[PDB]
Amino acid sequence: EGTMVEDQMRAWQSLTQPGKMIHLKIRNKDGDLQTVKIKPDVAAFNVGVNELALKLGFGLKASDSYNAEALHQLLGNDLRPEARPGGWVGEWLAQYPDNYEVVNTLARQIKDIWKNNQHHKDGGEPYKLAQRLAMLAHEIDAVPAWNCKSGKDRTGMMDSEIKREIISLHQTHMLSAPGSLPDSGGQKIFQKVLLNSGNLEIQKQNTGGAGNKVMKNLSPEVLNLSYQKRVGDENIWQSVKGISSLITS
Amino acid sequence: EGTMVEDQMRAWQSLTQPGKMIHLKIRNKDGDLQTVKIKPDVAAFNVGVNELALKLGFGLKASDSYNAEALHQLLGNDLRPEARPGGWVGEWLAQYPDNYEVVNTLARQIKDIWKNNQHHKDGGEPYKLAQRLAMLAHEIDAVPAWNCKSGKDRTGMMDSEIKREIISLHQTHMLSAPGSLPDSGGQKIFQKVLLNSGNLEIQKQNTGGAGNKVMKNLSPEVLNLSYQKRVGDENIWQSVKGISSLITS
Numbered sequence: 001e002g003t004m005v006e007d008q009m010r011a012w013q014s015l016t017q018p019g020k021m022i023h024l025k026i027r028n029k030d031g032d033l034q035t036v037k038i039k040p041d042v043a044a045f046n047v048g049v050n051e052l053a054l055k056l057g058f059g060l061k062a063s064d065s066y067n068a069e070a071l072h073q074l075l076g077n078d079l080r081p082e083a084r085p086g087g088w089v090g091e092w093l094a095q096y097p098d099n100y101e102v103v104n105t106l107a108r109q110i111k112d113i114w115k116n117n118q119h120h121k122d123g124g125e126p127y128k129l130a131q132r133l134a135m136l137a138h139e140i141d142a143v144p145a146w147n148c149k150s151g152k153d154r155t156g157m158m159d160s161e162i163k164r165e166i167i168s169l170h171q172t173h174m175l176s177a178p179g180s181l182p183d184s185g186g187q188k189i190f191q192k193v194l195l196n197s198g199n200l201e202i203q204k205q206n207t208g209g210a211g212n213k214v215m216k217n218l219s220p221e222v223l224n225l226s227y228q229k230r231v232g233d234e235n236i237w238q239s240v241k242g243i244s245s246l247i248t249s
Numbered sequence: 250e251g252t253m254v255e256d257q258m259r260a261w262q263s264l265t266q267p268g269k270m271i272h273l274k275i276r277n278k279d280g281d282l283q284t285v286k287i288k289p290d291v292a293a294f295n296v297g298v299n300e301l302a303l304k305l306g307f308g309l310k311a312s313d314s315y316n317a318e319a320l321h322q323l324l325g326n327d328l329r330p331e332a333r334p335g336g337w338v339g340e341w342l343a344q345y346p347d348n349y350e351v352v353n354t355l356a357r358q359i360k361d362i363w364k365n366n367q368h369h370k371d372g373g374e375p376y377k378l379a380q381r382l383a384m385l386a387h388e389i390d391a392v393p394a395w396n397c398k399s400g401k402d403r404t405g406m407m408d409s410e411i412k413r414e415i416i417s418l419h420q421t422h423m424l425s426a427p428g429s430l431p432d433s434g435g436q437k438i439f440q441k442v443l444l445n446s447g448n449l450e451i452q453k454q455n456t457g458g459a460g461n462k463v464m465k466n467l468s469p470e471v472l473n474l475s476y477q478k479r480v481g482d483e484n485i486w487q488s489v490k491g492i493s494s495l496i497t498s
Contacts (some may be wrong), residue, residue: 017349017353018333018339018342018349018353019343019344019345019346019348019349019352019353021345039345
């Protein structure tokens with residue numbers, strides 16, 4: 001998975017070479033290939049949400065070299081939690097949108113996590129940094145994109161995490177604090193999302209059986225990612241992990 | 250030559266005082282003096298290409314104080330070779346010109362030379378930094394200007410170096426690596442340039458005899474600037490240095 005990462009980062013760099021304008025082919029409404037011109041701007045991150053990265057800790061140093069550049073691109077050159085946002089966030093806020101409250105909160109939380117290196121552990125919830133990066137990107141009118149090795153297991157879990165937080169926030173609430181377990185109502189939301197999202201059908205379509213490889217229950221108990229607590233239900237947890245253990249392939 | 254440098258730097262500073270608009274007198278097409286208004290912006294460098302500066306090393310520390318400010322003005326506040334260009338280069342690239350390839354290469358090479366202090370020695374070619382600064386300035390639509398004590402010996406040599414590289418590049422090539430001797434074809438180009446440029450006539454006009462004082466052949470062999478290798482011809486080397494040794498004045 002190391003060489004996989006440099007291959008991805010190299011690809012993004014080659015498309016965002018400064019002053020280089022990108023040409024894309026698109027089928028128009030008449031079924032004819034047509035060339036369009038794009039000025040891309042990509043902020044590329046890598047976090048790692050496995051036990052291999054959170055319990056015993058692999059590639060933390062390797063990934064943080066990429067993440068530092070991306071944060072400077074996204075928030076500016078000053079990452080103190082009390083400073084004012086810069087970068088893309090600053091440009092969005094300079095328009096004085098009616099969205100300022102949520103944007104300011106998300107930027108502050110991200111700086112907090114980065115400062116204490118809270119993303120190196122799972123203080124009860126391992127997607128703390130990835131989830132907020134995606135939500136912030138949607139707020140400031142960028143496009144969020146995320147990926148895994150195969151695009152169905154860890155990708156599916158992050159999909160569910162984002163949907164849960166968006167739904168919880170939509171009820172005029174605030175955002176939850178980093179590294180905190182969901183409350184009773186949040187747990188009910190999360191349970192409904194995990195089953196009523198489209199992830200199970202994606203799993204079946206892509207493999208032939210429904211399941212998720214993120215749910216493991218390793219033998220030394222200190223190597224588990226603590227989804228038993230986030231999903232406060234044994235049966236639902238066993239339902240998310242479906243035939244996933246029978247797909248050794 | 251020290252006080253000469255502070256006099257020049259002081260002059261540039263006095264013309265580029267912030268918020269100060271400059272008034273120039275120009276003879277229009279009717280032969281009448283007319284006043285025009287200029288908003289100047291000058292990046293002033295000093296390098297030193299003598300044996301006094303490259304072999305035994307004089308004023309390296311003094312000049313680098315000026316060069317640091319000028320680079321920040323030209324490339325921005327981040328001079329890491331892998332970062333993205335800022336400053337004037339960044340502003341030019343933000344227009345997405347069809348010139349991006351050459352500009353990116355030149356900026357990268359300049360940062361490399363600055364990082365390793367390669368301009369403090371002559372790894373086979375002493376104009377490595379000056380030549381690239383002038384070429385980069387022309388690419389991003391600035392005006393390049395260079396000077397010597399008298400404006401005919403070291404100025405003439407830098408003139409020839411730039412012309413050789415431009416001609417070599419015009420054949421759709423790439424740029425050569427810093428501190429590398431020219432190949433066979435490059436040597437043929439350089440030999441033709443040194444004689445068919447206008448430098449010899451400038452020498453004769455300004456002095457009465459053709460020659461160049463840069464060609465010395467000092468007695469302790471470790472004090473020579475190694476143009477015997479760059480100009481792979483004894484007769485041509487002896488032809489560039491003409492009556493230059495008979496003009497003690």
